[PDB]
Every structure is written in structure tokens, then in C-alpha cells.
Write a protein that holds these residues in place. Structure first.
Motif, PDB file in Angstrom:
ATOM      1  N   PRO A  17       0.845  -1.210   0.000  1.00 51.29           N
ATOM      2  CA  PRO A  17       0.000   0.000   0.000  1.00 51.29           C
ATOM      3  C   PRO A  17       0.880   1.259   0.000  1.00 51.29           C
ATOM      4  CG  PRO A  17       0.195  -0.844   2.242  1.00 51.29           C
ATOM      5  CD  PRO A  17       1.056  -1.753   1.356  1.00 51.29           C
ATOM      6  N   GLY A  18       0.281   2.375  -0.284  1.00 57.99           N
ATOM      7  CA  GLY A  18       0.855   3.710  -0.319  1.00 57.99           C
ATOM      8  C   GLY A  18      -0.228   4.778  -0.454  1.00 57.99           C
ATOM      9  N   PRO A  19       0.199   6.040  -0.453  1.00 58.25           N
ATOM     10  CA  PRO A  19      -0.663   7.213  -0.596  1.00 58.25           C
ATOM     11  C   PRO A  19      -1.351   7.167  -1.980  1.00 58.25           C
ATOM     12  CG  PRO A  19       1.513   7.864   0.071  1.00 58.25           C
ATOM     13  CD  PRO A  19       1.632   6.418  -0.331  1.00 58.25           C
ATOM     14  N   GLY A  20      -2.692   7.303  -1.978  1.00 54.47           N
ATOM     15  CA  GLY A  20      -3.327   7.235  -3.340  1.00 54.47           C
ATOM     16  C   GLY A  20      -4.473   8.207  -3.380  1.00 54.47           C
ATOM     17  N   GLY A  21      -5.088   8.279  -4.541  1.00 57.06           N
ATOM     18  CA  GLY A  21      -6.202   9.216  -4.716  1.00 57.06           C
ATOM     19  C   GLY A  21      -7.052   8.833  -5.920  1.00 57.06           C
ATOM     20  N   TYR A  22      -8.127   9.563  -6.051  1.00 59.21           N
ATOM     21  CA  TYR A  22      -9.100   9.397  -7.112  1.00 59.21           C
ATOM     22  C   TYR A  22      -9.528  10.756  -7.656  1.00 59.21           C
ATOM     23  CZ  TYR A  22     -13.018  10.683  -4.122  1.00 59.21           C
ATOM     24  OH  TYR A  22     -13.923  11.389  -3.372  1.00 59.21           O
ATOM     25  N   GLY A  23     -10.092  10.684  -8.855  1.00 58.99           N
ATOM     26  CA  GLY A  23     -10.617  11.827  -9.577  1.00 58.99           C
ATOM     27  C   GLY A  23     -11.859  11.338 -10.299  1.00 58.99           C
ATOM     28  N   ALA A  24     -12.908  12.075 -10.124  1.00 56.90           N
ATOM     29  CA  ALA A  24     -14.164  11.694 -10.818  1.00 56.90           C
ATOM     30  C   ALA A  24     -14.855  12.987 -11.272  1.00 56.90           C
ATOM     31  CB  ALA A  24     -14.969  10.924  -9.808  1.00 56.90           C
ATOM     32  N   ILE A  25     -15.348  12.919 -12.481  1.00 53.83           N
ATOM     33  CA  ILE A  25     -16.087  14.032 -13.076  1.00 53.83           C
ATOM     34  C   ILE A  25     -17.506  13.519 -13.309  1.00 53.83           C
ATOM     35  CG2 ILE A  25     -16.297  15.359 -15.318  1.00 53.83           C
ATOM     36  CD1 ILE A  25     -13.125  15.260 -15.208  1.00 53.83           C
ATOM     37  N   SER A  36     -12.560  14.638  -5.786  1.00 50.32           N
ATOM     38  CA  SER A  36     -11.145  14.211  -5.689  1.00 50.32           C
ATOM     39  C   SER A  36     -10.737  14.284  -4.229  1.00 50.32           C
ATOM     40  CB  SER A  36     -10.288  15.073  -6.597  1.00 50.32           C
ATOM     41  OG  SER A  36      -8.923  14.559  -6.548  1.00 50.32           O
ATOM     42  N   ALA A  37     -10.066  13.231  -3.814  1.00 45.33           N
ATOM     43  CA  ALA A  37      -9.517  13.153  -2.433  1.00 45.33           C
ATOM     44  C   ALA A  37      -8.331  12.184  -2.422  1.00 45.33           C
ATOM     45  CB  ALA A  37     -10.616  12.873  -1.441  1.00 45.33           C
ATOM     46  N   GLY A  38      -7.419  12.387  -1.515  1.00 42.84           N
ATOM     47  CA  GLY A  38      -6.197  11.559  -1.307  1.00 42.84           C
ATOM     48  C   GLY A  38      -6.335  10.811   0.035  1.00 42.84           C
ATOM     49  N   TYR A  39      -5.798   9.582   0.066  1.00 41.01           N
ATOM     50  CA  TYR A  39      -5.785   8.686   1.194  1.00 41.01           C
ATOM     51  C   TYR A  39      -4.332   8.293   1.514  1.00 41.01           C
ATOM     52  CZ  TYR A  39     -10.750   8.166   0.427  1.00 41.01           C
ATOM     53  OH  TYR A  39     -12.080   8.365   0.259  1.00 41.01           O
ATOM     54  N   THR A  40      -4.021   8.285   2.788  1.00 40.84           N
ATOM     55  CA  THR A  40      -2.684   8.019   3.289  1.00 40.84           C
ATOM     56  C   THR A  40      -2.092   6.664   3.005  1.00 40.84           C
ATOM     57  OG1 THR A  40      -2.928   7.498   5.745  1.00 40.84           O
ATOM     58  CG2 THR A  40      -3.284   9.846   5.069  1.00 40.84           C
ATOM     59  N   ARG A  41      -2.941   5.631   3.056  1.00 38.25           N
ATOM     60  CA  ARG A  41      -2.432   4.227   2.862  1.00 38.25           C
ATOM     61  C   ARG A  41      -3.499   3.398   2.203  1.00 38.25           C
ATOM     62  NH1 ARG A  41      -1.984  -0.410   6.620  1.00 38.25           N
ATOM     63  NH2 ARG A  41      -0.149  -1.551   5.796  1.00 38.25           N
ATOM     64  N   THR A  42      -3.304   3.128   0.919  1.00 34.77           N
ATOM     65  CA  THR A  42      -4.414   2.388   0.198  1.00 34.77           C
ATOM     66  C   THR A  42      -3.795   1.723  -1.004  1.00 34.77           C
ATOM     67  OG1 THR A  42      -6.655   2.796  -0.725  1.00 34.77           O
ATOM     68  CG2 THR A  42      -4.902   4.578  -1.054  1.00 34.77           C
ATOM     69  N   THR A  43      -4.592   1.233  -1.960  1.00 33.22           N
ATOM     70  CA  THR A  43      -4.069   0.570  -3.163  1.00 33.22           C
ATOM     71  C   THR A  43      -4.649   1.232  -4.428  1.00 33.22           C
ATOM     72  OG1 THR A  43      -5.921  -1.017  -3.229  1.00 33.22           O
ATOM     73  CG2 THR A  43      -3.741  -1.833  -2.306  1.00 33.22           C
ATOM     74  N   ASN A  44      -4.073   0.964  -5.580  1.00 33.16           N
ATOM     75  CA  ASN A  44      -4.499   1.482  -6.889  1.00 33.16           C
ATOM     76  C   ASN A  44      -5.930   0.995  -7.109  1.00 33.16           C
ATOM     77  OD1 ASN A  44      -2.549   2.897  -9.500  1.00 33.16           O
ATOM     78  ND2 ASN A  44      -4.398   1.873 -10.179  1.00 33.16           N
ATOM     79  N   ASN A  45      -6.159  -0.281  -6.934  1.00 31.27           N
ATOM     80  CA  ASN A  45      -7.479  -0.902  -7.097  1.00 31.27           C
ATOM     81  C   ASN A  45      -8.598  -0.312  -6.262  1.00 31.27           C
ATOM     82  OD1 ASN A  45      -6.053  -4.164  -7.846  1.00 31.27           O
ATOM     83  ND2 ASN A  45      -6.222  -2.231  -8.955  1.00 31.27           N
TER      84      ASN A  45
END
Length: 155
Positions: A17-25, A36-45
Motif C-alpha cells: 500500500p501507499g498514498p493514493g487518490g481518485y478523480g471523478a467528473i 477528488s480526495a487523497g488517502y494516506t495508505r491504500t491501493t491502486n485498485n
């Protein structure tokens, strides 16, 4: 004013795991909503599934949706896994809970409120909205502010 809801999604992660995020329109009613938001410890999936979750949960009535994403994981879940997992009660063949069951169950609930058309784009041939998703997803991962509660090294 568009006659179909349009959703574009992307997720990104710097490790496993690592820092990840998403983007949605989301093009809903007469607006363009950007999530859009970032998470401290998560996965790409998990980020790719979160993208889709947050956009659909924003919908307050039964809509006709077109969701475009280049996510292979969402794609395999939707076309080869989900139907089968629902029949087995969300378990693997060795009888354990499926991976990211928390998110697939959440996605599944949002899905069943709408008529959805899936548009599988190729990473290098998406629309300008998919590129924006990617750029947002990446930026979010660089500045994480939320905890990805459902994540497990486990189950």
C-alpha cells in the motif's frame, strides 16, 4: 442539457500500500461536479473503485448513466466477477470474503439504483475528461488527507 448522466473516473497510488487518490467528473442535471480526495495508505485498485462509488452516490434519483474509465480492475469485476460473487455470497472458492468486499458491496448498492452503460476506454485513448481524472487522481495522492478504513494487508 445532456439526457444521460456522464461519469469519468480514475484512481492512482504510489505504492502497495501507499498514498493514493481518485478523480471523478460527473455531468449531472446542468452542472459538472468534480470529486477528488487523497488517502494516506491504500491501493491502486481501491482508488479506482472509490472513484466510481463517490460519483454514483452523488446521484439522488434513478438515472441513465454512461460511465467511462480505463480501469482494468473495475472492468474485470463488472464483466467476470460480480455476478458470480453474488451467487456465492461474496466469497472466494476457498470460502473467504472476496478482496475489497467492502467496496464491491458499496459499488454494487449504488449500481442497482440506476441503468448503467459502461465505456471501457484505453489508457492512451480516453477523452479529455479521463485525462483530467488522472491528473486529479495523481495530485490527490501527493497530498493525502483521509484514511482508507476498509484496507487490509489481509482478507
Amino acid at each position: 442539457m445532456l439526457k444521460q448522466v456522464e461519469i469519468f473516473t480514475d484512481g492512482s497510488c504510489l505504492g502497495n500500500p501507499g498514498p493514493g487518490g481518485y478523480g471523478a467528473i460527473l455531468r449531472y442535471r446542468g452542472r459538472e461536479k468534480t470529486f477528488s480526495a487523497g488517502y494516506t495508505r491504500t491501493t491502486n485498485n481501491r482508488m479506482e473503485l472509490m472513484a466510481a462509488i463517490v460519483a454514483l452516490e452523488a446521484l439522488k434519483e434513478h438515472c441513465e448513466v454512461i460511465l467511462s474509465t480505463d480501469s482494468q480492475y473495475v472492468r474485470q469485476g463488472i464483466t467476470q466477477w460480480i455476478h458470480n460473487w453474488k451467487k456465492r455470497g461474496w466469497k472466494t472458492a476457498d470460502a473467504k470474503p472476496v478482496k475489497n468486499v467492502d467496496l464491491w458491496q458499496r459499488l454494487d448498492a449504488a449500481l442497482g439504483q440506476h441503468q448503467i452503460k459502461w465505456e471501457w476506454v484505453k489508457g492512451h485513448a480516453g477523452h479529455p475528461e479521463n485525462e483530467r481524472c488522472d491528473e486529479l487522481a495523481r495530485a490527490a495522492a501527493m497530498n493525502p488527507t483521509l484514511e482508507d478504513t476498509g484496507y487490509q494487508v489481509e482478507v
